[PDB]
């Protein structure tokens, strides 16, 4: 359920396919069910947090369906951003 | 949402009255309305995290309600601490 933030702290910098998206969950947490994955990127579409387009099938990859983050999206990014800087001030607070 | 979290954290040490409750999370963060903590108080006492009882008339503060935490809540403050430590690392990663 934390999926959807990390999808669009990925798309951020880059737009990207399924296995860029994946690769970096992995990489960088100690998360990722593919299926997970898959349910949470249609989710976003649907709530124009993120917008899918195609590559070339004669394009260095095939073709792959990537995921640009929107101007909603990135709104989105931002608020969670300052929301967790004030959550983790708390928390450290009564949890540390 | 959050206050659930900070009330058992200021009840490991000591159990407390509302004031020192309300004072403890003043003085730690930046939150909290009076009513949003007997609001709490209660539905915590409901799902039996804390336990209530009454100082005596002729005590130095007069008669007080006092909560203790109980087992459950123990063990609820200890999955708390595991789940920030756990999301606290993931957030800092992607939203840092």
Redesign the interface.
């Given at each position: 359920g934390?999926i959807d933030?990390?999808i669009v702290?990925?798309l951020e910098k880059k737009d990207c396919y399924g296995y860029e998206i994946a690769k970096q969950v992995r990489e960088?947490?100690?998360?990722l069910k593919e299926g997970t994955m898959y349910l949470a990127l249609k989710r976003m579409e649907s709530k124009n947090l993120i917008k899918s387009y195609y590559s070339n099938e004669q394009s260095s990859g095939g073709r792959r369906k990537y995921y640009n983050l929107t101007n909603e999206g990135k709104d989105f990014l931002e608020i969670?951003?300052q929301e967790?800087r004030?959550?983790?001030?708390?928390?450290?607070?009564?949890?540390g």
């Amino acid at each position: 359920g934390y999926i959807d933030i990390l999808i669009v702290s990925i798309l951020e910098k880059k737009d990207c396919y399924g296995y860029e998206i994946a690769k970096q969950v992995r990489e960088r947490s100690e998360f990722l069910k593919e299926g997970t994955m898959y349910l949470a990127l249609k989710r976003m579409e649907s709530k124009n947090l993120i917008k899918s387009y195609y590559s070339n099938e004669q394009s260095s990859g095939g073709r792959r369906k990537y995921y640009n983050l929107t101007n909603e999206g990135k709104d989105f990014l931002e608020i969670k951003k300052q929301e967790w800087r004030f959550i983790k001030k708390v928390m450290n607070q009564f949890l540390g």
